[PDB]
Coordinates of all heavy atoms in Angstrom, one line a residue:
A1 N 3.4 18.1 13.5 CA 2.0 17.9 13.9 C 1.0 18.7 12.9 O 1.5 19.7 12.3 CB 1.7 18.2 15.3
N2 N -0.3 18.4 13.0 CA -1.3 19.2 12.3 C -1.8 20.2 13.4 O -1.7 20.0 14.6 CB -2.4 18.4 11.8 CG -2.0 17.6 10.6 OD1 -1.1 18.0 9.8 ND2 -2.6 16.4 10.5
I3 N -2.4 21.3 12.9 CA -3.0 22.2 13.8 C -4.5 22.4 13.5 O -4.9 22.0 12.3 CB -2.3 23.6 13.7 CG1 -2.6 24.3 12.3 CG2 -0.9 23.5 13.9 CD1 -1.9 25.5 12.1
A4 N -5.3 22.8 14.3 CA -6.7 22.9 14.2 C -7.1 24.5 14.5 O -6.5 25.1 15.4 CB -7.4 22.1 15.2
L5 N -8.0 25.0 13.7 CA -8.5 26.3 13.8 C -9.8 26.2 14.7 O -10.8 25.5 14.2 CB -8.8 27.0 12.5 CG -9.4 28.4 12.6 CD1 -8.4 29.4 12.9 CD2 -10.0 28.7 11.2
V6 N -9.8 26.8 15.8 CA -11.0 26.7 16.7 C -11.6 28.0 16.9 O -11.0 29.0 16.7 CB -10.6 26.1 18.1 CG1 -9.8 24.8 17.9 CG2 -9.7 27.1 18.8
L7 N -12.9 28.0 17.2 CA -13.7 29.3 17.3 C -14.4 29.3 18.6 O -15.3 28.5 18.9 CB -14.7 29.3 16.1 CG -15.8 30.4 16.2 CD1 -15.1 31.8 16.0 CD2 -16.9 30.1 15.2
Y8 N -14.1 30.2 19.4 CA -14.7 30.4 20.7 C -16.1 31.1 20.6 O -16.3 31.7 19.6 CB -13.8 31.2 21.6 CG -12.5 30.5 22.1 CD1 -11.4 30.5 21.3 CD2 -12.5 29.8 23.2 CE1 -10.3 29.8 21.6 CE2 -11.4 29.1 23.6 CZ -10.3 29.0 22.8 OH -9.2 28.4 23.2
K9 N -16.8 30.9 21.6 CA -18.2 31.4 21.6 C -18.3 32.9 21.6 O -19.4 33.5 21.2 CB -19.0 30.9 22.8 CG -19.0 29.4 22.9 CD -20.2 28.9 22.1 CE -21.5 29.4 22.7 NZ -21.5 29.2 24.2
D10 N -17.2 33.7 21.9 CA -17.2 35.1 21.8 C -16.8 35.6 20.5 O -16.8 36.8 20.2 CB -16.3 35.7 22.9 CG -15.0 35.0 23.0 OD1 -14.4 34.7 22.0 OD2 -14.5 34.9 24.1
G11 N -16.3 34.7 19.6 CA -15.9 35.1 18.2 C -14.4 35.2 18.0 O -14.1 35.6 16.9
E12 N -13.6 34.7 18.9 CA -12.2 34.7 18.7 C -11.8 33.4 18.1 O -12.3 32.3 18.4 CB -11.4 34.9 20.0 CG -9.9 35.2 19.8 CD -9.2 35.2 21.1 OE1 -9.8 35.3 22.2 OE2 -8.0 35.3 21.1
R13 N -10.7 33.4 17.2 CA -10.3 32.3 16.5 C -8.8 32.0 16.9 O -8.1 33.0 17.1 CB -10.4 32.4 15.0 CG -11.7 32.1 14.5 CD -11.8 32.3 13.0 NE -13.1 31.8 12.5 CZ -14.2 32.6 12.4 NH1 -14.0 33.9 12.7 NH2 -15.3 32.1 11.9
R14 N -8.4 30.8 17.0 CA -7.1 30.4 17.5 C -6.7 29.2 16.9 O -7.5 28.3 16.4 CB -7.1 30.4 19.0 CG -6.8 31.7 19.6 CD -6.4 31.5 21.1 NE -6.7 32.7 21.9 CZ -6.5 32.8 23.2 NH1 -5.8 31.9 23.8 NH2 -6.8 33.9 23.8
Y15 N -5.3 28.9 16.8 CA -4.8 27.7 16.4 C -4.3 26.9 17.5 O -3.6 27.4 18.4 CB -3.6 28.0 15.4 CG -4.0 28.3 14.0 CD1 -3.4 29.3 13.3 CD2 -4.8 27.4 13.3 CE1 -3.7 29.5 12.0 CE2 -5.1 27.6 12.0 CZ -4.6 28.6 11.3 OH -4.9 28.8 10.0
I16 N -4.6 25.6 17.5 CA -4.1 24.7 18.6 C -3.5 23.4 17.8 O -3.8 23.2 16.7 CB -5.2 24.2 19.6 CG1 -6.2 23.3 18.9 CG2 -5.8 25.4 20.2 CD1 -7.0 22.6 19.8
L17 N -2.5 22.8 18.6 CA -2.1 21.5 18.1 C -3.3 20.5 18.1 O -4.2 20.5 19.0 CB -1.1 20.9 19.0 CG 0.3 21.5 19.1 CD1 1.0 20.8 20.2 CD2 1.0 21.5 17.8
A18 N -3.4 19.8 16.9 CA -4.5 18.9 16.8 C -4.3 17.5 17.5 O -3.3 16.8 17.1 CB -4.8 18.6 15.4
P19 N -5.1 17.2 18.6 CA -4.9 15.9 19.2 C -5.5 14.8 18.4 O -6.2 15.0 17.4 CB -5.6 16.1 20.5 CG -6.6 17.1 20.3 CD -6.0 18.0 19.3
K20 N -5.1 13.6 18.7 CA -5.5 12.5 17.9 C -7.0 12.3 18.1 O -7.6 12.3 19.2 CB -4.9 11.2 18.3 CG -5.4 10.0 17.6 CD -4.6 8.8 17.8 CE -4.6 8.3 19.2 NZ -4.0 6.9 19.3
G21 N -7.8 12.1 17.0 CA -9.2 11.8 17.0 C -10.0 13.1 16.9 O -11.3 13.0 16.7
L22 N -9.4 14.3 16.9 CA -10.2 15.5 16.8 C -10.6 15.8 15.4 O -9.8 15.6 14.5 CB -9.3 16.7 17.3 CG -10.0 17.9 17.8 CD1 -10.5 17.7 19.2 CD2 -9.1 19.1 17.7
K23 N -11.9 16.1 15.2 CA -12.4 16.4 13.9 C -13.1 17.8 13.9 O -13.3 18.4 15.0 CB -13.5 15.3 13.5 CG -13.1 13.9 13.8 CD -14.2 13.0 13.4 CE -15.5 13.4 13.9 NZ -15.5 13.7 15.3
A24 N -13.5 18.2 12.8 CA -14.3 19.5 12.7 C -15.6 19.3 13.4 O -16.3 18.2 13.2 CB -14.5 19.9 11.3
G25 N -16.1 20.2 14.2 CA -17.2 20.1 14.9 C -17.1 19.7 16.4 O -18.1 19.7 17.1
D26 N -15.9 19.2 16.7 CA -15.6 18.8 18.1 C -15.6 20.0 19.0 O -15.1 21.1 18.6 CB -14.3 18.0 18.2 CG -14.5 16.6 18.0 OD1 -15.7 16.1 17.8 OD2 -13.6 15.8 18.0
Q27 N -16.0 19.8 20.2 CA -16.0 20.8 21.3 C -14.8 20.7 22.2 O -14.5 19.5 22.7 CB -17.3 20.8 22.1 CG -18.4 21.5 21.3 CD -18.7 22.8 21.9 OE1 -18.7 23.0 23.1 NE2 -18.9 23.8 21.0
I28 N -14.1 21.7 22.5 CA -13.0 21.7 23.4 C -13.1 22.8 24.4 O -13.8 23.8 24.2 CB -11.6 21.8 22.7 CG1 -11.5 23.1 22.0 CG2 -11.4 20.7 21.8 CD1 -10.1 23.7 21.9
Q29 N -12.5 22.7 25.6 CA -12.5 23.8 26.6 C -11.3 23.7 27.5 O -10.7 22.6 27.6 CB -13.9 23.6 27.4 CG -14.1 24.6 28.4 CD -15.4 24.5 29.1 OE1 -16.2 23.5 28.8 NE2 -15.7 25.4 30.0
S30 N -11.1 24.8 28.1 CA -9.9 24.9 29.0 C -10.4 25.4 30.4 O -11.5 25.9 30.6 CB -8.9 25.9 28.5 OG -7.7 25.8 29.2
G31 N -9.5 25.1 31.4 CA -9.8 25.5 32.8 C -9.9 24.4 33.8 O -10.0 23.2 33.3
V32 N -10.0 24.7 35.0 CA -10.1 23.7 36.0 C -11.3 22.9 36.0 O -11.3 21.8 36.6 CB -9.8 24.4 37.4 CG1 -8.5 25.1 37.5 CG2 -11.0 25.4 37.7
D33 N -12.4 23.4 35.4 CA -13.7 22.7 35.4 C -13.9 22.0 34.1 O -15.0 21.5 33.9 CB -14.8 23.7 35.6 CG -14.9 24.7 34.6 OD1 -13.9 25.7 34.6 OD2 -15.7 24.8 33.8
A34 N -13.0 21.9 33.2 CA -13.2 21.3 31.9 C -13.3 19.8 32.1 O -12.8 19.2 33.0 CB -12.0 21.6 31.0
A35 N -14.1 19.2 31.2 CA -14.3 17.7 31.2 C -13.0 17.0 30.8 O -12.2 17.6 30.2 CB -15.5 17.3 30.3
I36 N -13.0 15.7 31.2 CA -11.8 15.0 30.9 C -12.0 14.3 29.5 O -12.5 13.1 29.4 CB -11.5 13.9 32.0 CG1 -11.5 14.6 33.3 CG2 -10.1 13.3 31.7 CD1 -10.3 15.6 33.5
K37 N -11.7 15.1 28.4 CA -11.9 14.6 27.1 C -10.7 15.1 26.3 O -10.0 16.0 26.7 CB -13.2 15.2 26.5 CG -14.5 15.0 27.2 CD -15.6 15.1 26.3 CE -15.5 16.2 25.4 NZ -15.3 17.6 26.0
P38 N -10.4 14.4 25.2 CA -9.2 14.8 24.4 C -9.4 16.1 23.8 O -10.5 16.5 23.3 CB -9.2 13.7 23.3 CG -10.0 12.6 23.8 CD -11.1 13.1 24.7
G39 N -8.4 17.0 24.0 CA -8.4 18.4 23.6 C -8.6 19.4 24.6 O -8.3 20.5 24.4
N40 N -9.1 19.0 25.8 CA -9.3 19.9 26.9 C -8.1 20.1 27.6 O -7.2 19.1 27.7 CB -10.4 19.3 27.8 CG -11.7 19.4 27.2 OD1 -12.0 20.2 26.3 ND2 -12.6 18.5 27.7
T41 N -7.9 21.3 28.2 CA -6.7 21.6 29.0 C -7.0 21.9 30.4 O -7.9 22.7 30.7 CB -6.0 22.8 28.3 OG1 -5.7 22.6 27.0 CG2 -4.7 23.1 29.0
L42 N -6.3 21.3 31.3 CA -6.5 21.5 32.8 C -5.1 21.5 33.4 O -4.1 21.1 32.9 CB -7.3 20.4 33.4 CG -8.7 20.1 32.9 CD1 -8.6 19.1 31.7 CD2 -9.5 19.6 34.0
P43 N -5.0 22.1 34.6 CA -3.8 22.0 35.4 C -3.6 20.6 35.8 O -4.6 19.8 36.0 CB -4.0 22.9 36.6 CG -5.1 23.8 36.2 CD -6.0 23.1 35.2

């Protein structure tokens, strides 16, 4: 797979697996309150 470099609002950078359709500038988020969009992580 390809990986994506993401930048959190606090200034931390991380690598994630790139889901299909993800481009530069896309917004992702994790947690129980995240929206149901590609790239978001929820239980």
Side-chain angles (χ1 to χ4, degrees):
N2 291 326
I3 68 187
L5 178 76
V6 307
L7 167 74
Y8 288 86
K9 301 274 294 315
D10 49 39
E12 191 185 350
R13 280 178 173 91
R14 273 195 208 182
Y15 274 135
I16 68 163
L17 294 174
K20 176 169 70 166
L22 202 80
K23 314 178 314 311
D26 269 0
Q27 281 258 313
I28 62 149
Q29 184 177 2
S30 190
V32 301
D33 60 287
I36 310 296
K37 304 202 321 303
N40 292 333
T41 304
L42 302 88

